[PDB]
């Protein structure tokens, strides 16, 4: 009886203590960096606003104009290439938000589109991940036969090893690809890859948004979309191997508790 | 044998055709709206840049200054309240990106923090969702006993009804709460609630970012965090009821295929 509850409460208490350990570390890592940046930006504002004697209403309007032009200076978003990039970022839940629906009709359709798109996408990547893990298990057992191993067992530790180095590999191949095209540093390209395939998607870095690359370099658009849909497949297969048993075993324990009645 | 493959391929083909149906509709809904907005913003830029004779290097620097000041004009982010809000938006994968780690040390810690935080959060919300569905099943069967129903069965259709109206309810309670505090329209507040609890998180709308509300209105900070952690629990419970069987039945079918050997 109680086992389901004690594991639920221990998960909750673990989560909230993990948030506290998070928050106090992000304060320690960069409250001072924000404090430097604010002062430096304020000085640059004051000197420019003064040198041109910009009126407060004019500066406010210019600020709004700049902030709303930021999504357009990267090149036209809402054409088929960019609408396909957006649709990917909705149904996979990346949600960069480099562009977002302007009209209320766009917002309303985006909600109805996500409602159906996301269950479909979860079931697709989890099915294709289970196929990947089955294929890897076959090829690894055959590899042990070819290597003449003393037994053909393929333990959980072997699968978890190949899964983890598949994740590390696909992130490094992403970083090496994007750093050569977007001119980000390798570390920032790796950060962008991790934040994409994890589906966090802050959207401070966004691929393709460079001198109209969404229109002038369609082979690289194709790479970016295939990289998302393949990388999420590999991460999905890794969660399918390591984590998914824990989602169901609470219900399995409840079924066992009912069968013990 | 083939059933696992034909369902995998049909899911893939369904996903890609669903992306095409998406992209061609977002083009139809708002390519023209972008085309109007670009022209209007270009005219406002030209008139202001000309009226003050702003030099191109000065305008470029001012543009960078404005874009980097946007995350600070909302109030200081990296203090405990804002670091806790950020930590929520990482481990739940909302990822608004209203703020993002400035220093490379912040980025590196954010990656190690997400790696462990997200599996923990999935297991927490799926466990707590399974608890919610069990409790709802109990209370609904007792409600049928109290109402004197001709039988005490609690079918899937009854659970799916209560789950769906729980999702619709928690979104409406969110929209009614935020529209009264952020001064968004009710539709935009509902859009923000749906985009938050779906974990897409574009970050064009973000709660708390208003005249320092992260520091002056801590009771409303508390509401925003509880609304995220409760709303995701309800959405998690709904996916646990409707979708989760489809993630596993592909492996169950493979086990059956092995047992038939
Ligand atoms: C993706 C890779 C890099 C990391 C994967 C980590 C997860 C597999 C870990 C992280 C947190 C773990 C959970 C943290 C705490 C608990 C509570 C624990 O419950 C108890 O001990 C209660 C008493 C009992 O059930 O015996 C059961 C395991 C569980 C769910 C853990 C299951 C495994 C989790 C999800
Ligand atoms: C299912 C698996 C086995 C195969 C996947 C095939 C991919 C190589 C396809 C699927 C969708 C394709 C993309 C769909 C749409 C576009 C937009 C297209 O852009 C335009 O036509 C420009 C439009 C404009 O600028 O108005 C360039 C090709 C591209 C990126 C395609 C590149 C090739 C992709 C990624
Ligand atoms: C969250 C609410 C609002 C919507 C939930 C929708 C899902 C429950 C639907 C959406 C798309 C559906 C999938 C679309 C297509 C298929 C392929 C289908 O495969 C076959 O028919 C192959 C042959 C066979 O297996 O008999 C099996 C069901 C499945 C996975 C569906 C399972 C149920 C899904 C995930
Ligand atoms: C687990 C369940 C059953 C109970 C959940 C309790 C909540 C009501 C707690 C958990 C975390 C708490 C929050 C943790 C941290 C803060 C930041 C705090 O802000 C400050 O102290 C300002 C700091 C600064 O400005 O430097 C205001 C209260 C608040 C939002 C707390 C409000 C109450 C919360 C949401
Ligand atoms: K997400
Ligand atoms: K996001
Ligand atoms: K997201
Ligand atoms: K985002
Ligand atoms: K943004």
Author numbering:
A (entry chain B), B (entry chain A): 1 to 261
From the article:
Overall, our results provide further insight into the structure of both TASK-1 and TASK-3 channels and demonstrate that the X-gating mechanism is a highly conserved structural gating motif within the TASK channel family that, like many other K+ channels, also exhibits a degree of allosteric coupling between the lower gate and the filter gate.
The related TASK-3 channel is encoded by KNCK9 and shares 54% overall amino acid identity with TASK-1 and 80% identity within the pore-forming transmembrane regions. To investigate the structure of the related human TASK-3 channel we used an almost identical expression construct (Met1-Glu259) combined with a similar structural approach to determine a structure to 3.3 Å resolution. In TASK-3, the X-gate sequence motif (243VLRFLT248) is slightly different to that of TASK-1 (243VLRFMT248). Similar to TASK-1, cholesteryl hemisuccinate was also found bound to the same regions next to the X-gate between the M1, M2 and M4 helices, with a second site in a higher cavity along the M4 helices. However, this is consistent with the slightly reduced H+ sensitivity of TASK-3 which is considerably more active at pH 7.5 than TASK-1 and so would be expected to be in the stable, conductive conformation. The orientation of H98 is also consistent with structures of TASK-3 recently resolved by Lin et al. at pH 7.422. As found in TASK-1, the residues that surround the X-gate in TASK-3 are also involved in inter-and/or intra-subunit interactions known to influence channel gating in both channels.
